[PDB]
Structure 1
Amino acid sequence: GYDRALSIFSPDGHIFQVEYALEAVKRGTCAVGVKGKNCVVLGCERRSTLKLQDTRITPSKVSKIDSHVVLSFSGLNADSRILIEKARVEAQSHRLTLEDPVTVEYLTRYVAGVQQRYTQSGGVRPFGVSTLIAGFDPRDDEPKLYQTEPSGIYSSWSAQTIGRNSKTVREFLEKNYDRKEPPATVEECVKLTVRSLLEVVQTGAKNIEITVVKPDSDIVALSSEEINQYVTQIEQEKQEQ
């Protein structure tokens, strides 16, 4: 019965609720995604407001939507769950009707579509979430990475970041990522990602989680130790000079 127009135009042509949703994203942990020649890496910072967490169980920041596509986000954790669940259902519904898993653009267009609907439907407020969706289309090898925002707008990025301090790290990627030689290796792609997060996280090993997605449903979450090995090697290409 509740259908009050919560997202409406104000005098200057803005929809506050959607704009305020963005502000919620600006407060969430940073997420970054950069793509290589045959991989896409998603990095995320761990909320450090409170500590004494059980890392085994706590909802991971990067989520598999299917065997070949993942989604990370910045914003309201609770809202992310709704989007992620809808995405996972649509992923299985696509396999059932089209007999082929979703492309990454398709999955993105779907999540974004849901986000937009919540901006012009009665009685609901927009999602305070922006997402990074990455993976590989079926039987294809070109990496994909897209970003969606509360308004329901979406597009693809060679590298992108969202969340708190993203403005800063976005600046790091804009002058450290070259489309002529995109990180030609899993190893160098990861390094670039960590480098970008290091410019914000403030010296913290366990503070960064990296997820590497390769072609044909090969998705792996690097361990706390595998990443520390990177931060170390990184504090070298900074201390030798």
Structure 2
Amino acid sequence: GYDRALSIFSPDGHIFQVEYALEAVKRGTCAVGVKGKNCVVLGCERRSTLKLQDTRITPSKVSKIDSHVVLSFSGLNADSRILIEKARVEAQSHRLTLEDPVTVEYLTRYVAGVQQRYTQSGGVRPFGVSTLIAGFDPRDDEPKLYQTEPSGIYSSWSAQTIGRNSKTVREFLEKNYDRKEPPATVEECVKLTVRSLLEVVQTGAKNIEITVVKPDSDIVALSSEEINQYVTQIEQEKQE
């Protein structure tokens, strides 16, 4: 078997392969996560250099891991499929042994552990992917939003963004998001998410994807017209 230690320390104490995997994440299309009072919303950028696409069959950016948890990402698309698959398998395995679906923290901790393993295993390179994992624990109404990255560290976020120009949208969220009072409703949360993406995206046509997750396995993806209404509303208020 191929054994080479690809991820290793450098004189200054850095693991360059892990840090270069972060650059792949920085290249990826922007993804944003904002959690409200009774919901979480995952927003995703789709680059518009690709026309003549078939959006029916093209892989969606947000993936269901179980009926109650979702996973979006930024970075290498092929790499993300491997993490999603493993996560989906662990979700079913947890239901089988514990007789209870995974918590969002547990599912995140597993995905983060897989990513970490690939940073000190021989013959493999790290995942060029950072994920946003969102959902609701079984029989719980408290919203959960977690982030993971190639190194394997994970943490909980009131709101967070990853991908290209993420530092711009993080700047936006840092001043626009109030800890004392999060978005009280679904509409407020979606709007703040769309607003944050409109700082970076370009046009609000078929470039923005929005997915809303609510308690007790209530997940739905918004259509073009539904999203376009938020884009139309925000721009009219902006001209002031």
Q: Give TM class, smaller chain.
A: over 0.9
Map Cα deviations across residues 98-146 of structure 1 (whole Å, 9 max, x no partner).
Answer: 0000000000000000000000000000000000000000000000000
Aligned-residue offset at 1:72:
0.1
Aligned-residue offset at 1:236:
1.7
Q: Any residues of structure 2 matched to 1:210-221 within 5 Å, and which? A: 210-221=210-221
Map Cα deviations across residues 179-201 of structure 1 (whole Å, 9 max, x no partner).
Answer: 11100000000000000000000
Q: For 1:92 and 1:188, how far apart are their aligned partners in 2?
A: 33
SS at match of 1:41: strand
SS at match of 2:199: helix
Aligned-residue offset at 1:149:
0.2
Aligned-residue offset at 1:204:
2.6
Larger deviation, residues 199-208 vs 122-131? 199-208
Aligned-residue offset at 1:205:
1.8
Q: Which residue of 1 aligns with 2:203?
A: 203
Aligned-residue offset at 1:51:
1.7
Q: For 2:93 and 2:162, how far apart are their aligned partners in 1?
A: 29
TM-score normalised by length of structure 1: 0.99
Q: Which residue of 2 aligns with 1:176?
A: 176
Q: For 2:52 and 2:179, how far apart are their aligned partners in 1?
A: 41
RMSD: 0.6
Map Cα deviations across residues 68-125 of structure 1 (whole Å, 9 max, x no partner).
Answer: 0000000000000000000000000000000000000000000000000000000000
Map Cα deviations across residues 39-80 of structure 1 (whole Å, 9 max, x no partner).
Answer: 000000002232211000111000000000000000000000
Aligned-residue offset at 1:239:
1.1
Q: For 1:188 and 1:52, how far apart are their aligned partners in 2?
A: 33
Query: Segments of 4+ in structure 1 off by > 6 A?
Result: none
Q: For 1:49 and 1:154, how far apart are their aligned partners in 2?
A: 32
Q: For 1:109 and 1:101, how far apart are their aligned partners in 2?
A: 14
Q: For 1:84 and 1:233, how far apart are their aligned partners in 2?
A: 34
Aligned-residue offset at 1:203:
2.4
Q: For 1:22 and 1:49, how far apart are their aligned partners in 2?
A: 23
SS at match of 1:201: coil
Map Cα deviations across residues 196-229 of structure 1 (whole Å, 9 max, x no partner).
Answer: 0000002232110000000000000011100000
Structure 1 unmatched runs, 5+:
none
Q: For 2:94 and 2:203, how far apart are their aligned partners in 1?
A: 43
Q: For 2:6 and 2:195, how far apart are their aligned partners in 1?
A: 41
TM-score normalised by length of structure 2: 0.99
SS at match of 1:213: strand
Q: For 2:11 and 2:5, how far apart are their aligned partners in 1?
A: 16
Aligned-residue offset at 1:237:
1.7
Give aligned pairs, total: 240
SS at match of 1:175: helix
Q: Percent identity?
A: 100
Q: For 1:49 and 1:231, how far apart are their aligned partners in 2?
A: 20
SS at match of 1:132: strand
Q: Any residues of structure 2 matched to 1:59-78 within 5 Å, and which? A: 59-78=59-78
